[PDB]
Each structure stands twice: as C-alpha cells, then as structure tokens.
Specification:
Bound molecules: protoporphyrin IX containing FE, 2-ethenyl-1-methylpyridinium
EC number: 1.11.1.-
Function: Destroys radicals which are normally produced within the cells and which are toxic to biological systems.
CATH architecture of the largest domain: Orthogonal Bundle
Distance between the termini: 44 Å
Number of strands: 5
Strand content: under 5%
Subunit structure: Forms a one-to-one complex with cytochrome c.
Keywords: Heme, Iron, Membrane, Metal-binding, Mitochondrion, Oxidoreductase, Peroxidase, Transit peptide, Transmembrane, Transmembrane helix
Radius of gyration: 18 Å
Oligomer: monomer
Shape: globular
Number of helices: 14
CATH topology of the largest domain: Peroxidase, domain 1
Main location: mitochondrion
Length: 292
C-alpha cells in the first residue's frame, strides 16, 4: 500500500485557498451560458468525483492525490468523456494560481461548485501533490451505469463507502444532465438543474418511471415530467436497503446535506495521509456570504 502524505503548498494558508475558491466561484457566475445555461457547476462536481473515484483501497492506487487526470491516459478514459470541459474551465484558474497542485485544484473545483449551487458546506483539506505520469491509474475503475444494486454496492466497497454513503453521494445526480455523446444516456433537457437539493430522492419516489430505450439503444428510466434516471440510479429504489435511505433523504433536507458533505469530503480525501500537525480542514465562505 502506497503512502501519500499531504504536503501544504509552501507558505500557503486559508486565505490563499479562499482566493482560489473565489476565482472559481466568480468564473462559475461569469460563464453562465455553458450547456444550455446549466453552467459549469455540475461538470466540476463530476470532475472532482471522477478524479477521486479511481481510488483502490487495497493498494492505494488512483485517488485525488496525484492529480493524474492531467495525463492523457486518464483524461482520455471513455468514463471521463465530457470532463475536458471542466478541465478547460479550470485552466485559467491554474494559470492565475500556479502554486496550487492539480489534485487540490480539481477537488476544490467540486467543493466550490457544490457550495455555490447552494449545497452544504464541504470542509476541504489542501496538500495533494502532483505525481508522475507512470502513477496514472488505468481506465476502467469508474462505474458502469447499466447495472443493478448489487453491482453498485460491490463497486463502492472498493472506495470504502457503505450503503448510506453510496445513497448520499448519488444525490449529486440531482445536478446537470446526461449527454448522449458522452455516456450513451440523455436527459433531462428542460428539466435540468444547477441548484443542489434533495430532488434526486424526491424524483425517485414520486415520478412515474417508464423503462425506455434512448437513441443510443441503451435503457434508461424516463418520466412524463422530462426527468430521467440511470439503471444504477433506479437500483436505489429496487434494493430494500437503499430504498429506506432514499426515503430518509427525501424527507430530510438537512440530513441529506450533512451526510453528503461527510461522504464527499471522504471521497475527495481517500488515499491521503494527513500529518497530525496538518492544518484543520478549511470551510470556505461562499461569494454570497462575502458580499461578492
Ligand atoms: C454508480 C455510480 C455512478 C454512475 C454509474 C454515474 C454515471 C453517470 C453518467 C453516465 C453521467 C452522464 C455523463 C454525461 O453524459 O455527461 C453522470 C453525470 C453526473 N454525475 Fe454520475 N455516476 C455515478 C455516481 C456519481 C457520484 C458519486 C457523483 C458525485 C458525488 C456523481 C456526479 C455526477 C454529476 C454532477 C453529473 C452531471 C454532469 C454534467 O451535467 O455534466 N455521479 N453520472
Ligand atoms: C439530472 C439527472 C441526472 C444527471 C446525471 C446522472 C444521473 N441523473 C439522473
């Protein structure tokens, strides 16, 4: 098992990272047209998850630490199709703040997006260090969407996530949309959202879902309201243990926010050893809280 020790960017502190947060947040506000006015929030959340979701608890390969998404093998992963948009968004931020590591930037992009979209505060720790090209994990570590609850449960054990953590994390599927050219799934169109809420769970429970084939000849669940769910999303109401948790989050916005915050921080920190004298996690103020 590889050890990756968090190492604070030299001389940097909370205020430095709040500046980076602010630059990302201001650009999120500025570049509002992206993806039919969804904006870049959802894709940045997905990017933070995909750079983290390569982790394997068994040998500490993959994970957010090394910033390896910057290397061609990983950015060309078919599982990552469309994330180049998030990377391009972050390029000018990195140019302005060249001192931040790639892993810190990609993960901070996700935290910033969640908070700016009115989601929970996500505490965030610095200190990821760029590692060489040969540390890039092979393609195929990110999950398939065409599978069932048993697949989801087993998949997430590799990331050390339990049922509650899985169901909480999946609530991010309130955000943005599927794009046929990226993943072979499509929708929503007009029903897409860039505000972080517990809508995913409400939709699972309340919509009249029909199993249909999309234009890529893949099955997905669609509703008359114009919403969609992936087979893996729908599996959360097919499995009785997942279903109980779906009901809980559908009925308690605050609980969902608290549990998502913990699971998302954990996801972004998997694989990293924080020295006992490392700084405490940072909680960034939103632009709104700063009057900016
Ligand atoms: C079983 C696990 C998961 C599967 C199979 C899955 C699959 C997918 C697929 C196929 C898309 C559409 C990509 C596209 O066409 O652009 C998507 C989008 C997205 N995913 Fe997941 N995902 C999973 C878990 C997660 C998790 C844990 C998060 C974060 C906590 C997340 C965040 C997102 C976001 C925010 C989008 C929207 C991106 C956009 O609008 O551009 N997903 N996911
Ligand atoms: C907004 C819907 C959505 C987006 C991405 C993945 C799954 N879903 C259900």
């Amino acid at each position: 098992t590889l050890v990756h020790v968090a190492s604070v960017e030299k001389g940097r502190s909370y205020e430095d990272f709040q500046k980076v947060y602010n630059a990302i947040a201001l650009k999120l506000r500025e570049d509002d047209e992206y993806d039919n006015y969804i904006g870049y929030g959802p894709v940045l959340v997905r990017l933070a998850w995909h750079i983290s979701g390569t982790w394997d608890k068994h040998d500490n390969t993959g994970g957010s630490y090394g910033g390896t998404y910057r290397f061609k093998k990983e950015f060309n992963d078919p599982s990552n199709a469309g994330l180049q948009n998030g990377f391009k968004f972050l390029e000018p931020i990195h140019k302005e703040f060249p001192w931040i590591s790639s892993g810190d930037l990609f993960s901070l992009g996700g935290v910033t997006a969640v908070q700016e979209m009115q989601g929970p505060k996500i505490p965030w720790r610095c200190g990821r260090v760029d590692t060489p090209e040969d540390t890039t994990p092979d393609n195929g570590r990110l999950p398939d969407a065409d599978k069932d609850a048993g697949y989801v449960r087993t998949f997430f054990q590799r990331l050390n996530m339990n049922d509650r953590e899985v169901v909480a994390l999946m609530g991010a599927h309130a955000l943005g949309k599927t794009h046929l050219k990226n993943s072979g799934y499509e929708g929503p169109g007009g029903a897409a959202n860039n505000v972080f809420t517990n809508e995913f769970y409400l939709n699972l429970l309340n919509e009249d879902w029909k199993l249909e084939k999309n234009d890529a000849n893949n099955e997905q669940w669609d509703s008359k309201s114009g919403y969609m769910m992936l087979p893996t999303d729908y599996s959360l109401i097919q499995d009785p243990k997942y279903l109980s948790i779906v009901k809980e989050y559908a009925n308690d916005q605050d609980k969902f926010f608290k549990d998502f915050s913990k699971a998302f921080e954990k996801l972004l920190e998997d694989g990293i050893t924080f020295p006992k004298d490392a700084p405490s996690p940072f909680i960034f103020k939103t632009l709104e809280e700063q009057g900016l």
